[PDB]
């Protein structure tokens, strides 16, 4: 069928595994069969590696995400990222991925192609964040989250000069979630920068977009200073 | 003896009651004896009302605080406010009161007398906050907290033109606690204003006090709009 059906089928199989309905061998067989039905051979070999017990579910998910990035399947990428952030106990990152997925679905139904590359770059950043979390290395997580906040700053700057309003609310929600994540990570300066960007976005949405820019360059210099 | 030891004795009695070591009759008798020893008759009658069972511990604490406000005892005021905010399960307000007590204790050992009036006004605002919380009326709590944030903003504006450094850290911590309180109350705009003031204070303390003023009028304008 179409690439949208494959993503939904794979996602459903993964939720069945995660909820405890099926086990690892059943999941491997089902997902390998689904990939074989659609002609995706490399994904099939990656799942075969799980069927042999060489790798685990998390490593298989990471390799599947890399292969889908090489191939260019977007809905499968979102499904795999949600599964990765659900295997690791982080609901906030799953919420961020969900909001990004809704933004991508809104963007693809119109002619907006500039936001697509920015969403792809943020997907790369989220993938690196997940990889760093799997490595239990907390120092790179903060830097990657700072890069993600800068990318959201770029997108909100682009969107303010346009008439988009739902994008503003979604970016505000995402920035609030990252601020909570930073607070839970024992950091206060990066949380303050994220909340500054969120406040600027809210001010621009309200109607007072004259005061937003001062906050905007203030937050960007703070973010640039804190990365180094 | 001196009023400093009276507050310590009363506070120790109240913590003994709160920890479950002594009961209400024992606490009433002990506190009435302490007040009678130091010659405070009105406080003794207020405690006598508790001994007769007419009022409860929280009501007695409220009337004791009002009587101490009329008399002008500061350490007793702080003790009574901490007891009030401990009877109501709000550790964050107790932390705010503790930081205010440290601020007042630092101020009294030097010649700073202008901060005393503002600390007294903030104590009045905190007393109103406690009264509103006891009434379970959540709408006035947010407005009173907004007034408290405005007072803290005025104090940080006064302190920035001076050379104090620990003070700025103290308003920063207080404002962060108030922002957490606002977030837990299901509000986002007032929390954003409190975090804006805290960020301005942090920036001024760091050394870049030129960027803090824009934040200062932005936050104060937002607070003024949100109060009405
Ligand atoms: Zn096979
Ligand atoms: Zn802070
Ligand atoms: Zn008596
Ligand atoms: Zn917000």
Distance from CA of A214 to the nearest CA of B (A): 8
Q: Judge whether A123 and A131 are in contact, CB under 8 Å.
A: no
How far is it, in rounded angstroms, from Cα B197 to Cα B148? 12
CB contact under 8 A, B199 and A196: yes
Cβ-based burial of B73 (10 A; exposed 0-12, middle 13-18, buried ≥19)? buried
The closest of A142, A100, A105, A102 to A121, measured between CA atoms, is A100
Q: Which residues contact A75 (CB under 8 A, 6 or more apart)?
A: A3, A4, A7, A8
Residue A153 Cα distances to A184, A195, A198, B48, angstroms: 22, 11, 9, 63
Distance between CA atoms of residues A68 and B40, nearest Å: 79
Task: Name every residue whose Cβ is closer than 8 Å to that of residue A107 and which is 6 or more positions away in sequence.
Answer: A115, A116, A119
- Helix, coil or strand: residue A20: coil
Of B188, B198, B214, the CB nearest to A214: B214
Nearest Cα residue to B201 out of B226, B227, B176: B176
Distance, CA of B2 to CA of A30 (rounded, Å): 81
Reported for A164-169, long-range contacts at CB under 8 A and 24+ positions apart, including other chains, are A165/A205, A166/A106, A167/A103, A167/A106, A168/A201, A168/A202, A168/A204, A168/A205, A169/A205
* Residue A225: DSSP 8-state: H
User: How far is the centre of ligand 3, averaged over its atoms, from the C-alpha of B32 (Å)?
Assistant: 7
Point out the ligand nearest to the CA of residue A33: 1
Using CA coordinates, name the residue in chain B closest to A201.
B192
Distances (CA, A) of A107 to A102, A167, A204, B212: 9, 10, 21, 37
Report the alpha-carbon distance of residue B109 to residue B176 in Å, rounded: 27
For residue A81, the distance in angstroms to the closest alpha carbon of chain B comes to 29
Chain A residues 161-180 with a CB less than 8 Å from chain B: 176
Residue B46 CA neighbour count, 13 Å, CB half: 19
Residues 6+ apart with CB under 8 A from A68: A43, A76, A77, A80
Spatial neighbors of A31 by CB under 8 A, at least 6 apart, are A10, A13, A14, A47
Q: Residue A145 in contact with residue A126, Cβ under 8 Å?
A: no
Burial of A16 from C-beta contacts in 10 A (0-12 / 13-18 / 19+) = middle
> Resolution in angstroms, to 1 decimal, for this deposition?
2.8
CB burial of A132-159 (b: ≥16 within 10 Å; e: otherwise) equals bbeeeeeeebbbbbbbbbbbbbebbbeb
Give burial (CB, 10 Å; 0-12/13-18/19+) of B144: buried
**Residues B84 and B58: beta-carbon distance below 8 Å:** yes
Distance of CA A34 to the CA centre of its chain: 24
d(Cα B196, Cα A219) in Å, to the nearest integer?
12
Q: How far is B185 from chain A (nearest CA, A)?
A: 16
Helix axis angle, B114-134 to B57-71, nearest 10° = 160
Could you tell me which residues come within 8 angstroms of residue A109 by beta carbon, excluding any fewer than 6 positions away? none
Among chain B residues, the shortest Cα distance to A190 is held by: B199
Contacts of residue B189 in chain A, CB cutoff 8 Å?
A: 202
In chain B, which ranges are continuous DSSP H helix? 3-18, 24-37, 41-51, 57-71, 74-87, 91-108, 114-134, 138-160, 166-184, 189-206, 212-227
Task: Name every residue whose Cβ is closer than 8 Å to that of residue A160 and which is 6 or more positions away in sequence.
Answer: A168, A201, A204, A209, A212
Among all bound ligands, the one having the nearest atom to the CA of B47 is 3
Q: B143 touching A, CB under 8 A?
A: no
Q: Which residues contact B107 (CB under 8 A, 6 or more apart)?
A: B115, B116, B119
Binary contact (A176, B188; C-beta < 8 A): yes
Would you say A194 and A226 are in contact if contact means Cβ atoms under 8 Å apart? Answer: no
- Which of A95, A76, A56 shows the shortest CA–CA distance to A10? A76
**Burial of residue B110, with CB atoms counted within 10 A of its CB: 0-12 exposed, 13-18 middle, 19 or more buried:** exposed
Q: How many other CB atoms are there within 10 angstroms of residue A225's CB atom? A: 11
CA-CA-CA-CA torsion for B1, B5, B9, B10, nearest 10 degrees? 90
Contact between B160 and B204 under an 8 Å Cβ cutoff? The reply is yes
Instruction: Please enumerate in sequence order all residues whose Cβ is within 8 A of that of A85, keeping only pairs 6 or more positions apart, or say none.
Output: A93, A94, A97, A130
H/E element, A95:
helix A91-108
Count of Cβ atoms closer than 10 Å to residue B8 Cβ = 15
CA atoms within 13 A on the CB side of B101: 16
Q: Does B147 touch chain A (CB under 8 A)?
A: no
Contact criterion met (CB < 8 Å) for B218 and A215: yes
Question: For residue A43, how far is its CA from the centre of ligand 1 (angstroms)?
Answer: 10
Contact A85, A93 (CB under 8 A): yes
What own/partner pairs with CB < 8 Å and gap ≥ 24 does B54-59 have? B57/B17, B57/B24, B57/B27, B57/B87, B58/B84, B58/B87, B58/B88, B58/B134
Which residue, among B192, B201, B208, would best test binding to A if mutated, counting the most A CBs under 10 Å from its CB?
Answer: B192
CB A120 within 8 A of CB A156: no
Report d(CA A124, CA A132) in Å as an integer.
12
Q: Is the dihedral of CA B91, B97, B100, B105 positive or negative?
A: negative
By the 10 Å C-beta count (0-12 exposed, 13-18 middle, 19+ buried), B180 is classed as middle
């Amino acid at each position: 069928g179409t690439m949208e059906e494959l993503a939904r089928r794979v996602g459903r199989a993964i939720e069945r595994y995660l909820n405890g309905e099926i086990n690892e061998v059943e999941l491997a067989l089902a997902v390998g069969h689904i990939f074989r039905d659609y002609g995706l051979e490399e994904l099939h070999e990656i799942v075969d590696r799980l069927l042999a017990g060489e790798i685990s579910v998390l490593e298989m998910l990471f390799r599947l995400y890399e292969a889908a990035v090489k191939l260019g399947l977007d809905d499968l990428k979102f499904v795999l990222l949600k599964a990765i952030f659900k295997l690791l106990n982080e609901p906030k990152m799953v919420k961020i991925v969900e909001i990004l997925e809704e933004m991508y679905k809104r963007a693809v139904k119109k002619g907006d192609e500039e936001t697509i590359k920015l969403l792809k770059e943020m997907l790369e950043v989220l993938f690196e964040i997940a990889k760093a979390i799997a490595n239990n290395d907390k120092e790179e997580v903060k830097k990657l989250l700072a890069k993600f906040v800068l990318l959201l700053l770029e997108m909100v700057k682009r969107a303010i000069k346009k008439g988009d309003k739902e994008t503003l609310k979604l970016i505000h929600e995402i920035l609030d979630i990252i601020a909570e994540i930073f607070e839970e990570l024992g950091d206060d300066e990066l949380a303050h920068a994220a909340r500054l960007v969120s406040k600027a976005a809210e001010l621009a949405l309200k109607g007072k977009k004259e005061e937003a820019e001062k906050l905007f360059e203030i937050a960007e210099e703070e973010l640039k200073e804190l990365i180094e």
